[PDB]
Every structure is written in C-alpha cells, then in structure tokens.
Motif scaffolding. Sequence first.
Motif, PDB file in Angstrom:
ATOM      1  N   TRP A 283      55.998 -50.004 -25.575  1.00 27.36           N
ATOM      2  CA  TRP A 283      55.496 -49.342 -24.380  1.00 27.36           C
ATOM      3  C   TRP A 283      55.453 -47.819 -24.638  1.00 27.36           C
ATOM      4  O   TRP A 283      56.194 -47.330 -25.447  1.00 27.36           O
ATOM      5  CB  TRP A 283      56.336 -49.718 -23.150  1.00 27.36           C
TER       6      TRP A 283
ATOM      7  N   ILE B  95      61.644 -39.235  -4.067  1.00 31.84           N
ATOM      8  CA  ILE B  95      62.327 -38.969  -5.351  1.00 31.84           C
ATOM      9  C   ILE B  95      61.400 -38.585  -6.496  1.00 31.84           C
ATOM     10  O   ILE B  95      61.835 -38.421  -7.627  1.00 31.84           O
ATOM     11  CB  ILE B  95      63.234 -40.133  -5.814  1.00 31.84           C
TER      12      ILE B  95
ATOM     13  N   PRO C 176      64.642 -36.178 -15.339  1.00 26.30           N
ATOM     14  CA  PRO C 176      65.766 -36.700 -16.098  1.00 26.30           C
ATOM     15  C   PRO C 176      66.325 -37.976 -15.488  1.00 26.30           C
ATOM     16  O   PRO C 176      66.605 -38.022 -14.313  1.00 26.30           O
ATOM     17  CB  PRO C 176      66.830 -35.605 -15.911  1.00 26.30           C
TER      18      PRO C 176
ATOM     19  N   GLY D 157      63.227 -48.026  -9.985  1.00 29.93           N
ATOM     20  CA  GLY D 157      64.207 -46.955  -9.710  1.00 29.93           C
ATOM     21  C   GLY D 157      63.734 -45.518  -9.890  1.00 29.93           C
ATOM     22  O   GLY D 157      64.563 -44.602  -9.866  1.00 29.93           O
ATOM     23  N   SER D 158      62.420 -45.307 -10.070  1.00 30.52           N
ATOM     24  CA  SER D 158      61.831 -43.976 -10.018  1.00 30.52           C
ATOM     25  C   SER D 158      60.485 -44.065  -9.405  1.00 30.52           C
ATOM     26  O   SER D 158      60.092 -45.146  -8.898  1.00 30.52           O
ATOM     27  CB  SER D 158      61.751 -43.333 -11.400  1.00 30.52           C
TER      28      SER D 158
ATOM     29  N   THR E 226      66.721 -50.179 -15.217  1.00 28.92           N
ATOM     30  CA  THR E 226      68.086 -50.120 -15.728  1.00 28.92           C
ATOM     31  C   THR E 226      68.533 -51.500 -16.311  1.00 28.92           C
ATOM     32  O   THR E 226      68.163 -52.586 -15.826  1.00 28.92           O
ATOM     33  CB  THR E 226      69.058 -49.632 -14.612  1.00 28.92           C
TER      34      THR E 226
ATOM     35  N   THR F  58      69.186 -41.496 -15.877  1.00 28.13           N
ATOM     36  CA  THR F  58      70.538 -41.754 -16.330  1.00 28.13           C
ATOM     37  C   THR F  58      70.516 -41.736 -17.840  1.00 28.13           C
ATOM     38  O   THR F  58      71.391 -41.172 -18.479  1.00 28.13           O
ATOM     39  CB  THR F  58      71.011 -43.105 -15.774  1.00 28.13           C
TER      40      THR F  58
ATOM     41  N   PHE G 169      64.155 -40.893 -24.546  1.00 27.83           N
ATOM     42  CA  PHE G 169      63.311 -41.675 -23.651  1.00 27.83           C
ATOM     43  C   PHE G 169      62.622 -42.823 -24.391  1.00 27.83           C
ATOM     44  O   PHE G 169      62.995 -43.998 -24.221  1.00 27.83           O
ATOM     45  CB  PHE G 169      62.265 -40.743 -23.023  1.00 27.83           C
TER      46      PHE G 169
ATOM     47  N   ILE H 213      61.756 -45.428 -27.211  1.00 23.53           N
ATOM     48  CA  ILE H 213      62.663 -46.237 -28.008  1.00 23.53           C
ATOM     49  C   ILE H 213      61.865 -46.816 -29.139  1.00 23.53           C
ATOM     50  O   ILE H 213      60.737 -47.241 -28.911  1.00 23.53           O
ATOM     51  CB  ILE H 213      63.180 -47.423 -27.194  1.00 23.53           C
TER      52      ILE H 213
ATOM     53  N   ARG I  70      59.461 -36.105  -8.765  1.00 22.25           N
ATOM     54  CA  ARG I  70      59.387 -34.769  -9.224  1.00 22.25           C
ATOM     55  C   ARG I  70      57.901 -34.398  -9.335  1.00 22.25           C
ATOM     56  O   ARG I  70      57.062 -35.254  -9.579  1.00 22.25           O
ATOM     57  CB  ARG I  70      60.086 -34.635 -10.579  1.00 22.25           C
TER      58      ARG I  70
ATOM     59  N   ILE J  11      71.317 -49.390  -5.213  1.00 28.83           N
ATOM     60  CA  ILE J  11      69.874 -49.471  -5.324  1.00 28.83           C
ATOM     61  C   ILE J  11      69.485 -50.614  -6.230  1.00 28.83           C
ATOM     62  O   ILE J  11      70.278 -50.987  -7.058  1.00 28.83           O
ATOM     63  CB  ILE J  11      69.286 -48.220  -5.992  1.00 28.83           C
TER      64      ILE J  11
ATOM     65  N   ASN K 193      71.851 -52.683 -17.048  1.00 24.49           N
ATOM     66  CA  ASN K 193      73.094 -53.271 -16.648  1.00 24.49           C
ATOM     67  C   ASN K 193      73.250 -53.338 -15.148  1.00 24.49           C
ATOM     68  O   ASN K 193      72.637 -52.603 -14.432  1.00 24.49           O
ATOM     69  CB  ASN K 193      74.229 -52.383 -17.168  1.00 24.49           C
TER      70      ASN K 193
ATOM     71  N   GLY L  72      66.978 -55.342 -23.924  1.00 22.71           N
ATOM     72  CA  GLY L  72      67.297 -54.296 -22.989  1.00 22.71           C
ATOM     73  C   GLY L  72      66.445 -53.090 -23.304  1.00 22.71           C
ATOM     74  O   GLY L  72      66.956 -52.003 -23.437  1.00 22.71           O
ATOM     75  N   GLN L  73      65.146 -53.309 -23.432  1.00 21.11           N
ATOM     76  CA  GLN L  73      64.158 -52.254 -23.654  1.00 21.11           C
ATOM     77  C   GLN L  73      63.093 -52.223 -22.570  1.00 21.11           C
ATOM     78  O   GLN L  73      62.022 -51.647 -22.757  1.00 21.11           O
ATOM     79  CB  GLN L  73      63.502 -52.468 -25.008  1.00 21.11           C
ATOM     80  N   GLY L  74      63.410 -52.855 -21.450  1.00 17.13           N
ATOM     81  CA  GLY L  74      62.571 -52.850 -20.260  1.00 17.13           C
ATOM     82  C   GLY L  74      61.477 -53.878 -20.254  1.00 17.13           C
ATOM     83  O   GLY L  74      61.251 -54.543 -21.250  1.00 17.13           O
TER      84      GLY L  74
HETATM   85  O1  LIG Z   1      68.032 -44.553 -16.664  1.00 24.01           O
HETATM   86  C1  LIG Z   1      67.473 -45.570 -17.048  1.00 24.01           C
HETATM   87  N1  LIG Z   1      66.384 -46.072 -16.449  1.00 24.01           N
HETATM   88  C2  LIG Z   1      65.507 -45.264 -15.587  1.00 24.01           C
HETATM   89  C3  LIG Z   1      64.048 -45.413 -16.097  1.00 24.01           C
HETATM   90  C4  LIG Z   1      63.971 -45.332 -17.647  1.00 24.01           C
HETATM   91  C5  LIG Z   1      63.208 -46.239 -18.350  1.00 24.01           C
HETATM   92  C6  LIG Z   1      63.100 -46.178 -19.727  1.00 24.01           C
HETATM   93  C7  LIG Z   1      63.802 -45.228 -20.445  1.00 24.01           C
HETATM   94  C8  LIG Z   1      64.599 -44.325 -19.763  1.00 24.01           C
HETATM   95  C9  LIG Z   1      64.664 -44.357 -18.369  1.00 24.01           C
HETATM   96  C10 LIG Z   1      65.559 -45.510 -14.108  1.00 24.01           C
HETATM   97  O2  LIG Z   1      64.547 -44.714 -13.483  1.00 24.01           O
HETATM   98  C11 LIG Z   1      66.902 -45.103 -13.496  1.00 24.01           C
HETATM   99  N2  LIG Z   1      66.753 -45.095 -12.049  1.00 24.01           N
HETATM  100  C12 LIG Z   1      67.899 -44.382 -11.390  1.00 24.01           C
HETATM  101  C13 LIG Z   1      67.648 -42.838 -11.518  1.00 24.01           C
HETATM  102  C14 LIG Z   1      68.682 -42.038 -11.970  1.00 24.01           C
HETATM  103  C15 LIG Z   1      68.438 -40.662 -12.095  1.00 24.01           C
HETATM  104  C16 LIG Z   1      67.211 -40.105 -11.775  1.00 24.01           C
HETATM  105  C17 LIG Z   1      66.175 -40.885 -11.291  1.00 24.01           C
HETATM  106  C18 LIG Z   1      64.769 -40.248 -10.924  1.00 24.01           C
HETATM  107  F1  LIG Z   1      64.260 -40.658  -9.763  1.00 24.01           F
HETATM  108  F2  LIG Z   1      64.743 -38.927 -10.866  1.00 24.01           F
HETATM  109  F3  LIG Z   1      63.959 -40.625 -11.883  1.00 24.01           F
HETATM  110  C19 LIG Z   1      66.401 -42.254 -11.196  1.00 24.01           C
HETATM  111  C20 LIG Z   1      68.230 -46.532 -18.002  1.00 24.01           C
HETATM  112  C21 LIG Z   1      69.623 -46.653 -17.995  1.00 24.01           C
HETATM  113  C22 LIG Z   1      70.223 -47.577 -18.881  1.00 24.01           C
HETATM  114  N3  LIG Z   1      71.518 -47.792 -18.935  1.00 24.01           N
HETATM  115  C23 LIG Z   1      72.484 -46.817 -19.466  1.00 24.01           C
HETATM  116  C24 LIG Z   1      73.848 -47.441 -19.200  1.00 24.01           C
HETATM  117  C25 LIG Z   1      73.579 -48.922 -18.798  1.00 24.01           C
HETATM  118  C26 LIG Z   1      72.100 -48.970 -18.559  1.00 24.01           C
HETATM  119  O3  LIG Z   1      71.534 -49.992 -18.110  1.00 24.01           O
HETATM  120  C27 LIG Z   1      69.438 -48.368 -19.709  1.00 24.01           C
HETATM  121  O4  LIG Z   1      69.913 -49.210 -20.457  1.00 24.01           O
HETATM  122  N4  LIG Z   1      68.102 -48.248 -19.683  1.00 24.01           N
HETATM  123  C28 LIG Z   1      67.353 -49.105 -20.599  1.00 24.01           C
HETATM  124  C29 LIG Z   1      66.413 -48.248 -21.506  1.00 24.01           C
HETATM  125  C30 LIG Z   1      65.041 -48.826 -21.300  1.00 24.01           C
HETATM  126  C31 LIG Z   1      65.114 -49.456 -19.919  1.00 24.01           C
HETATM  127  C32 LIG Z   1      66.474 -50.115 -19.852  1.00 24.01           C
HETATM  128  C33 LIG Z   1      67.493 -47.368 -18.826  1.00 24.01           C
END
Ligand SMILES: O=C(N[C@@H](Cc1ccccc1)[C@H](O)CNCc1cccc(C(F)(F)F)c1)c1cc(N2CCCC2=O)c(=O)n(C2CCCC2)c1
Length: 370
Positions: free
Chosen positions: A118, A129, A73, A37-38, A223, A75, A111, A113, A131, A218, A225, A14-16
């Motif tokens: 990566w 969406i 920012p 998702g971004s 993400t 999630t 952010f 890990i 920024r 979406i 989960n 779960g590191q993408g």
């Molecule tokens: O928020 C997360 N993902 C982001 C991109 C990201 C990648 C790597 C590290 C951190 C973040 C997605 O962009 C989320 N998309 C929805 C979103 C929410 C809020 C803002 C935005 C936007 F557009 F402004 F970016 C987009 C997130 C969220 C995760 N979570 C937290 C609770 C369960 C879950 O899956 C998570 O496990 N990850 C993992 C870390 C590495 C990738 C999988 C990521």
Amino acid sequence: SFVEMVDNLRGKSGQGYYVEMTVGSPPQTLNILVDTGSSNFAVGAAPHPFLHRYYQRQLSSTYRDLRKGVYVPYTQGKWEGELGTDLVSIPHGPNVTVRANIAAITESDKFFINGSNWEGILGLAYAEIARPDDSLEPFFDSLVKQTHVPNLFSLQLCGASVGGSMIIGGIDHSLYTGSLWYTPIRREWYYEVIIVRVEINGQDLKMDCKEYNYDKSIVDSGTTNLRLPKKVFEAAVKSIKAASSTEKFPDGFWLGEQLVCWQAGTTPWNIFPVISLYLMGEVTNQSFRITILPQQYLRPVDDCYKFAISQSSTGTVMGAVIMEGFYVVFDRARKRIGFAVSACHVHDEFRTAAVEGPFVTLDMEDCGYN
Ligand SMILES: O=C(N[C@@H](Cc1ccccc1)[C@H](O)CNCc1cccc(C(F)(F)F)c1)c1cc(N2CCCC2=O)c(=O)n(C2CCCC2)c1
C-alpha cells in the motif's frame, strides 16, 4: 446491491488492510490502507524505497494545488506534505467519482512499511480530527455530499496474508451471522464508544468503569492491537497470567517484546481465557457484550505468536485484534456502531467469538471520561 464490494480488501498480517483506488485524470491506481482512526486522505507522492508506486500530480489534468502544507503524527509513524484536490474513485466500490481533498506526502518517518503493498491511507473518521484542522473535509464526507451513497459503511476484516470487505453505503447479510447489536457514537471525532465492563474468563476486573475509557475508547481499523490504558492493561495481564499459569512465559512476552512457540498444530488454546467487553446499548440501562478468543489476541507470524494486547496512554483502541472477530457497522447516519459475529471468524472446536445481549448495567453515562 453490494456483492460488487465483497472481498475488496487485502493485506499482510499486522500491516493493515487496503482497498484499490484511482486518483486524477487519467486514473492512477494505488492501494490505500483503510483507517477508521483518522480522517486524512493521504498518498505517497514522491520517491521512497518502500514504495513501488506513487502519485504524480504533474500528469493529472484534474489536480489543484491548495498551496498549504499539512502534518500528521500517529501513534506509530508521521508524515508531512502538500494539500490539493483531485478526482478519485474506488474500482470495487460504488460506481462514482468524487473530488476529494488529498495530501501529497513529501517526507515521512516509520510510516511506510517494507513490502506492504500500500502507498497511502484513507482516513474514514470525522473532520474534527483532520489536520491541519476542522475545515479540511474528509473523503467520506465528500462522497456523501457529492453523490447519493448512504452515510454508512461496514467492515469485515478476516485475519486468515489477509483479506476482507468494505461495503460502502450499507450492510451485507452474507458477511455475518446472528444479530447485529449497536452502541452509540459518543461524539463525532474518532468513532468513540463507551465500554462499561470488562471480564476475563467470566470474572469481572472490578474497576471503576471510567478507567476503561480513560481519555477515550475508540474503534480503529488502522491499529493492530487491542490497546488498553496503563491501569487496565496491568490488571488485564494479571488475570490473563493466572488463568494461563499451568504454563509460564518470559516477562518479555506480556510486553510484546518476544514471541512464543509450540509444535505446529499443538497450540494450547484452551489454557487461555476469553475476554469480554460490555458496551453501552441503545435502550435505558441496556448493554451487550463482545467476546474474543485467544486466537484473536495471540497473533501469528513450530507455530509462533505475539501477544497483541498492549499498553496505551491515549485511551482504549479497539484495533484489528477486536475487529477480525466481527462485522462492524459504522452507521454514521444514526450515530452508532453495530457489531455481529463475522462470517469469517476463527473457530475453536470448543468456543466461539460472540456478540450477546441484552444485559443490564446501571449509570452507563458515568463510565465516560471528561
Ligand atoms: O498508529 C497507528 N495507526 C494509525 C494509522 C496508521 C496506519 C499505517 C501506518 C501508521 C499509522 C491510526 O490512525 C491511529 N489512530 C489513533 C490516532 C492516534 C494519534 C493521532 C491520530 C490522528 F487523527 F491525528 F491521525 C490518530 C498504528 C499503531 C500500531 N500499533 C503500535 C502499538 C500496537 C499497535 O497496534 C500499529 O501496529 N499499526 C500498524 C502499522 C500499520 C497498521 C497497523 C498502526
């Protein structure tokens, strides 16, 4: 044409999932997490203890400062930095070079890990969406404008460390079996869809379908989960508990607080229910369903697993949990997302992940929140 892109993705758990890219002249090589998702393209551009490599603007002759900061920012995690443009390629992608916007990441928090492999993030969704705003063109939009690449891509994420394919510019029939089934993109910002019914072990959760899309639903490769709005999450957990009551687990499991273990090989998959999402279809009063197995929503790390369904307050997020079972086609040119049974999905000898239709569902427009 696309064998060259097959297997261009790697990662951990779960590191993408990440693809190899080059930036600037001479080409600097980085691995970039692929994120539906971004919509910002961004890269580590300064020392960090979790980065083994980073982008160095000084020594690219094709760099351009845009003299404007930016902040994003998620999630999970957040970062700030400095905008510019540069020349970018994808080595196992199409044979092309483009001039794209790039955020040079200067500070960040939760952010990057440790040991992830990566160093940046490729936001594949729409400008709405980005920024700091609308007007920062995302990577794929530049790709499509600057070349003759068709305006679609497709993802096959294998959950086996971990691998897959990002086919930029089309669809590869070796990555899936069965038919592709399509759902409209409701609006071009996130890859937004409409869920119209939810079943657990063939039994309907019996809620007003608006609740399934509360805020929004979406599709998000960045993400981990399957995230579900508050109301839906509990209802989901009740039904999942009842169908698995033949054994009991800590309250901390259901919250992703814990972890749960069994003798290597002996996991009681069968006691766990199938989950189906019905999605809006292409034709009047027409829907289809995607079904996932517990092998998708119990994610492995004695064999031990974490419950990878969790609560959300910003709507439904269909992350890797959903995507690992399917080949997912982001058909921006027709505003639709296709699903098919992935060629690399985790089989049960008793049950399979499925994509099934047509079904009939009335008032599907009404399921979307406003
Ligand atoms: O928020 C997360 N993902 C982001 C991109 C990201 C990648 C790597 C590290 C951190 C973040 C997605 O962009 C989320 N998309 C929805 C979103 C929410 C809020 C803002 C935005 C936007 F557009 F402004 F970016 C987009 C997130 C969220 C995760 N979570 C937290 C609770 C369960 C879950 O899956 C998570 O496990 N990850 C993992 C870390 C590495 C990738 C999988 C990521």
